[PDB]
């Protein structure tokens, strides 16, 4: 491969050209280097949060601008840095490349191609700290995001521009719902209608490189990597890089949002973002706050999350949906960061290990799992046309509200008991198996007209699968009609009821 040799030759010649065009005199001198921190004497006119280059080749961000010497964090190890080293100034605030060539690639916090598939075609370069859209330049959420999870679709709706939190405990299924949504978006990501395209952008802050390798292998197996971008900040990387990565990914998604497209961001394990910020603030001798965390972690999370929004028609009616993930220690949602994030998001998706060990694979605590948007951002077929899909929330609350303390009194209580337990066994789903609205509607519609006559509990799963078969075969007209029009008309309600009762008699 001689071509990379002359490529490197011209690289080195422009390297010389760029290097010998500075004649800087404010280039500071390193006073002392700490654990990833370096105070430097110099840079009189340095901007805040501005990137720097060390003479060794390590980057740095200007956090503290106290008089005399400047607090510089390190994007990488303090391995190669010593005292008395000349520190080059970029002249610009920390930036990340943005563009459509990102799709199918894996990059780091800064944005360098780390997957090893060549350089990155970037259509632009946006800031890591950009202002959230104002009160007017936005529109309310109306278009629903189809997760493929029946418990996450018919019960806790999400849409373009909302902020749904996957709150839960360790290894409960927090990443599972996100990856399932990413796989589910493939149905419309393969078409031509751009108003229905949902490109996926995912952050990996703190997760080990093996986990992200398995994850990317997953998306490429199901052929979802072509519309997904992975930014990785493993625990091996320095705290500044982990702290910066989610902001860069937010800018990446905001590129699509401002260009009129629709995108989805998964803020996976935003807690280690907080601990990296803790390390940053403590190593900068910044006075800590509650339980050693920096004070402005609420502002940190607010500025990051509120960038996701649904734009109005004037600017292009783009969207950006935030999907953050927070892990809690022993189910303690009263913990500081869990409280901040539950107060910052537009609803939450609670997952707990107890229901997980009860058999419920999604482990969605419908008691606490709530969405600030209901009818809005929901497909109409899973709405008032189905009737009870307006009010299953009350039904699942009451069925839990009479388990043993509300002991069965009369036949109505027994009927509600059977209905509720059959439904809870029905809502079960398996990972790596996203579903579609056109076959959500029949299953839960059967949950109102004939569900207690299901063929015993251990065999309601193949009951739902056989119902799906009996509706995809010999009944494709119903599935189609409900999938393009998106709602159930009067004759369509009659046909659906007829089919449900026909298979009930079967």
């Amino acid at each position: 491969k001689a071509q990379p040799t002359e490529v490197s030759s011209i690289l080195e010649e422009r390297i010389k050209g760029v290097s010998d065009e500075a004649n800087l005199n404010e280039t500071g001198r390193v006073l002392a280097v700490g654990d990833g921190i370096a105070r430097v004497f110099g840079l009189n006119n340095i901007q805040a949060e501005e990137l720097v280059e060390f003479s060794s080749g390590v980057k740095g961000m200007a956090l503290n601008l106290e008089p005399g010497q400047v607090g510089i964090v390190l994007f990488g190890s303090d391995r190669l840095v010593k005292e008395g080293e000349l520190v080059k100034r970029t002249g610009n605030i920390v930036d990340v490349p943005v563009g459509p060539g990102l799709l199918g690639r894996v990059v780091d916090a800064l944005g360098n191609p780390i997957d090893g598939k060549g350089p990155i075609d970037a259509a632009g370069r946006s800031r890591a700290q950009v202002k959230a859209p104002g009160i007017l330049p936005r529109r309310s959420v109306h278009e629903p995001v189809q997760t493929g999870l029946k418990a996450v679709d018919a019960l806790v709706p999400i849409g373009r521009g909302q902020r749904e939190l996957i709150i839960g405990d360790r290894q409960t299924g927090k990443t599972a719902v996100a990856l399932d949504t990413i796989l589910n978006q493939k149905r419309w990501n393969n078409g031509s209608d751009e108003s229905k395209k949902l490109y996926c952008v995912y952050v990996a802050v703190g997760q080990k490189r093996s986990t992200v390798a398995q994850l990317v292998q997953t998306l490429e197996q199901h052929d979802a990597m072509k519309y997904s971008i992975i930014v990785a900040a493993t625990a091996s990387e320095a705290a500044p890089l982990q702290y910066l990565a989610p902001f860069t990914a937010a800018s990446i998604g905001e590129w699509f949002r401002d260009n009129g497209k629709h995108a989805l961001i998964v803020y996976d394990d935003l807690s280690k973002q907080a601990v990296a910020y803790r390390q940053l603030s403590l190593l900068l001798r910044r006075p800590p706050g509650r339980e050693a965390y920096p004070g402005d972690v609420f502002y940190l999370h607010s500025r990051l999350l509120e960038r996701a929004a649904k734009l109005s028609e004037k600017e292009g009616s783009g969207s950006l949906t935030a999907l953050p993930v927070i892990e809690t220690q022993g189910g303690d949602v009263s913990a500081y960061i869990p409280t901040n994030v539950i107060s910052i998001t537009d609803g939450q998706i609670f997952l707990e290990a107890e229901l997980f060990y009860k058999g419920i694979r999604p482990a969605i605590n419908v008691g606490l799992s709530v969405s600030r948007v209901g009818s809005a951002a929901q497909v109409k077929a899973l709405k008032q046309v189905a009737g009870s899909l307006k009010l299953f929330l009350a039904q699942y609350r009451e069925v839990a509200a009479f388990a043993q303390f509300g002991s069965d009194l009369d036949a109505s209580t027994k009927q509600t008991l059977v209905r509720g337990e059959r439904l809870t066994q029905l809502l079960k789903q398996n990972q790596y198996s996203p579903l579609a609205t056109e076959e959500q509607v029949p299953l839960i519609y059967a949950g109102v007209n004939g569900h207690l006559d299901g063929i015993e509990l251990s065999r309601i799963g193949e009951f739902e699968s056989s119902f799906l078969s009996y509706l995809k075969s010999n009944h494709n007209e119903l599935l189609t009609e409900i999938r393009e029009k998106g709602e159930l008309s009067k004759e369509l309600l009659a046909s659906l009821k007829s089919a449900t009762e026909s298979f009930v008699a079967t």
Binding site: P4, E21, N23
Partner: protein
């Protein structure tokens, strides 16, 4: 036959890495270090004279 070619790409860069070791070991045994200071002198003249 594709990732073998891809591995062929990756391995080729790897011996180029040890080639630089052969290159850099050639860099340290020259009188150019004496000649290189003149390169800065002419370069730094061109630098500030631009200003």
């Amino acid at each position: 036959w594709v990732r073998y070619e891809a591995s062929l790409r990756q391995l080729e860069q790897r011996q180029l890495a040890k080639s630089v070791i052969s290159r850099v070991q050639s860099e340290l045994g020259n009188p150019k270090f004496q000649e290189k200071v003149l390169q800065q002198s002419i370069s730094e003249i061109e630098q500030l004279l631009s200003k």
